[PDB]
Amino acid sequence: MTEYKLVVVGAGGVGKSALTIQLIQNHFVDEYDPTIEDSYRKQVVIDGETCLLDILDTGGQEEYSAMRDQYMRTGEGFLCVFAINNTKSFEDIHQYREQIKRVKDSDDVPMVLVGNKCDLAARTVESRQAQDLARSYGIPYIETSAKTRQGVEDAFYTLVREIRQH
């Protein structure tokens, strides 16, 4: 069957693991255990197609990691995640996109910008600001809540639909 290699990246604590775990295991992780690199696999049907999602959940990073770059090289699509209540995480997105461009050696890599923790009221990143950033990259912007599951399936499935247009 068709396999889709997805990689989740973004600043520490934005909810990358919570999003992946909500998608794959249907529960919300309340505690904060920093990730290095964890992988998840699951067969799902997306738009009538039975396929296998292979998801690499990476941890936030502010220091070079040769190993990190190597694990990311095989990714086919990337979820770039920031949290809507953490301006710095949004400002960090451009660096993650640059890392992706490097490891893939391409300026055209399937990606989706995700603004997580949309259930929280302390918003410092407005939807419009994120929409503008995503537009500049030629990619979709989707808000999510790993807590309520709002937009979770939408974010990952949209990433699959982006790989399909590639």
Ligand SMILES: Nc1nc2c(ncn2[C@@H]2O[C@H](COP(=O)(O)OP(=O)(O)NP(=O)(O)O)[C@@H](O)[C@H]2O)c(=O)[nH]1
């Ligand atoms: N309210 C709320 N909290 C969230 C959401 N997503 C994650 N969190 C919380 O934020 C904290 C960190 O989440 P986690 O998924 O571990 O972050 P991460 O990006 O994987 N961290 P790392 O980069 O260190 O692996 C946890 O306490 C978790 O419950 C969300 O959508 N809403």
Ligand SMILES: [Ca+2]
């Ligand atoms: Ca723990």
Ligand SMILES: [Ca+2]
């Ligand atoms: Ca390269």
Ligand SMILES: [Mg+2]
């Ligand atoms: Mg994590």
